[PDB]
Design a protein around this ligand. Structure first.
Ligand SMILES: [Ca+2]
Ligand SMILES: [Ca+2]
Length: 227
């Protein structure tokens, strides 16, 4: 019921490009993989191209593709993300790390030909030198979360909020509160959803032959909350 829905019935190649500055530490990440929205499935490999990543890889997972969520057929009228394609959407976030600094991000997600592209600028400030982020105290793992979606009708987009729980090496938890807004790039109509959420599961791993600083990500994203 959108033109965009049909762009995602098969396997779609994905590119991710991020430039970051966290407390003056500048870095870039390039990612490649593919997405199969029929199964809510994402498989991606990220590589830090400027050397060693200066923050923990788990802190960047949410920044590095919600147009690949599997929306059940009865919920397809609530898929804002695909409806903005191919022209795309801007995805903006503030991520507040409890007792620590914050990330501000701006992403443009759209098709470049047949390839779905996520281009990101990230700015992190007020981080603690011996905090869990700059001190690299977060485990290389990931929890499952619900991301809550609301229409923003006076902006023709959506508002999204959720809390990520990052495991800390001492057994504790680093909360990362996400405030998110998405707005279409083009001028065409989009689908404005009723309230609902995306259930997310993610698995981080390493490529045994890769010597560069990297992250392999397997994700499943499923819309829910409307019956
Ligand atoms: Ca450590
Ligand atoms: Ca309605």
């Amino acid at each position: 019921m959108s033109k965009g829905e049909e762009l995602f019935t098969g396997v779609v190649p994905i590119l991710v490009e991020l430039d970051g500055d966290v407390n003056g530490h500048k870095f870039s990440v390039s990612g490649e993989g593919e997405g199969d929205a029929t199964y809510g499935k994402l498989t991606l490999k990220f590589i830090c191209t400027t050397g060693k990543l200066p923050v923990p890889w788990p802190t960047l997972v949410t920044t590095f593709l919600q147009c690949f969520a599997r929306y059940p057929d009865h919920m397809k009228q609530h898929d804002f993300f695909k409806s903005a394609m191919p022209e795309g959407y801007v995805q903006e976030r503030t991520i507040f790390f409890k007792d620590d600094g914050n990330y501000k991000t701006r992403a443009e997600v759209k098709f470049e030909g047949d390839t779905l592209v996520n281009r990101i600028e990230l700015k992190g400030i007020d981080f603690k030198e011996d905090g869990n982020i700059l001190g690299h105290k977060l485990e290389y793992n990931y929890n499952s979360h619900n991301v809550y979606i609301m229409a923003d009708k006076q902006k023709n987009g959506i508002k999204v909020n959720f809390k990520i729980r990052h495991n800390i090496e001492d057994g504790s938890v680093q909360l990362a509160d996400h405030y998110q807004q998405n707005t279409p790039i083009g001028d065409g109509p989009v689908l404005l959803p009723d309230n609902h959420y995306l259930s997310t599961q993610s698995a981080l791993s390493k490529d045994p032959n890769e010597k560069r600083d990297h992250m392999v990500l397997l994700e499943f994203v499923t819309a829910a909350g409307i019956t």
